[PDB]
Amino acid sequence: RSITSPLVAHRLKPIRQKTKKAVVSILDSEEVCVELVKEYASQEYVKEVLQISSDGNTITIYYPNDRPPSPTDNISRYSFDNLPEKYWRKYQYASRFVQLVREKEPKIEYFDRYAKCILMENSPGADFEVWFYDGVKIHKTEDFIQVIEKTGKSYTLKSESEVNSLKEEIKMYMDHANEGHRICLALESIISEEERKTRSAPFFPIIIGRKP
Amino acid sequence: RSITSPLVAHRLKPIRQKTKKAVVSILDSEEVCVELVKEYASQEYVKEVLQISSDGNTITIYYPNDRPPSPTDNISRYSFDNLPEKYWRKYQYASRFVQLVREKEPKIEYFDRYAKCILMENSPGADFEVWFYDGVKIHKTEDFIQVIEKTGKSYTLKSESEVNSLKEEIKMYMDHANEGHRICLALESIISEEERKTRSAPFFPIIIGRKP
């Protein structure tokens, strides 16, 4: 708990990503599995299966001795708080993969007067992309802001301290982009509060308005 | 006002519906024009143009003596409340045209556990269509409820004694549709309440969730 936040894979599209360290996948049930694989002879196979619940709270490990291996009798279960030092690095690897996905998949896609405002799933501090209808793009991250001109020229900035030195050509775009970012954030809280009151379908992702 | 409610053409797609009596169209400015047409020589033309504001409150009529002609000096203006008996019938013609459009264009398109719930623009009492993933359809109007079974059989319900005559197989569907209806209406009110506070682009139409 002291190293990383719980893995949350709510509302993510299913995917099976094969990497050099392990094969990590998001299931249709929103659970995340990491398959530890080892090379042998002319065909590799699975050595250990780590399955993390969609909220990151419950972890099960099994191995019966391109699809998820079936559950077996040789299965152990731990809670997030009671995760051993073994599997510690493995959980974080799965978390990194999930963040890589949450950073790209949108949560609120809002079409305003001048741009397509996209609020990403990787909350808190969720990434926010503003695609202006004129070709200009602003990409807001928690750490930095990327600004791209219509001609393909681009540059990165960092923070509020740079505002009083910003050219008007960008400042007007930014004044709007921050208004759009506020609106998406305001709606997220407003709808999320309504979502929590009803045991029903999720209310995300949402699309507001239509592109012109 | 005692005859019809004001014409409202907010958030509607542009359209030009041509008849042999008049041409009624929705502009990209959300204004609605009715062009009175008469046959002339080898090419028919417009004799009088009536322009209704997007909220139905302001009506202007002009004619200087395939799109609306530019405004002229021979123009008169009325408010909705003091609209003369002359041209009264034309306002109603445009009003019914807009309602036909508002009845079909969606406002909230919500994907729940079992159906695609569509809340239409023709508020108050907006039509609500529930398209179940298994093929069952329930169409709720202010006046009646139409139920279409998965096998193609269909019937309408006009009174409670008929609603309570439904098979339990269908009552389960109707109970679900009513919960979907409540949620869409609750969100419609909640978002509208936020929309009224924000000097920005409209917050409708919206899509909630993704088809499974």
Numbering used by the authors:
A (entry chain B), B (entry chain A): 3 to 67, 76 to 222
From the primary publication:
Next, we systematically mutated the four PC3 residues to negatively charged aspartic or glutamic acid and generated a condensation-proficient (CP) gain-of-function mutant (i.e., the S698E, S700E, T704E, T707D mutant). To gain insight into how the CP mutations alter the physicochemical properties of CPB, we determined the crystal structures of both CPB CP and CPB CP_v1. While extensive efforts to obtain a high-resolution CPB CP structure yielded only a 3.7 Å overall resolution, the structure of CPB CP_v1 was solved at 2.64 Å. Therefore, the structure model of CPB CP was generated using a combination of RosettaCM and Rosetta/Phenix crystallographic refinement (TFZ = 16.4 for the initial model building, and Rwork/Rfree = 0.2709/0.3092 for the final model). An individual alignment of PB1 or PB2 of the CPB CP_v1 structure with the respective domain of CPB CP showed a Cα root-mean-square deviation value equal to 0.6970 or 0.7679 Å, respectively, well within the acceptable range of two superimposable structure models. Notably, the PB2-tip region is composed of a stretch of mainly hydrophilic residues with four conserved hydrophobic residues (i.e., Y750, L752, V758, and L761) scattered along the disordered region. A large fraction of these residues, including the four hydrophobic residues, were absent or lacking their side chains in the CPB CP structure, a striking deviation from an α-helix-containing ordered loop found in apo-CPB. Interestingly, while WT CPB exhibited only a low level of ANS binding, the CPB CP mutant displayed drastically increased ANS binding at an elevated temperature. This suggests that the conformation of CPB CP renders a temperature-dependent dynamic disorder and that CPB CP could be condensation-prone due to increased hydrophobic surfaces.
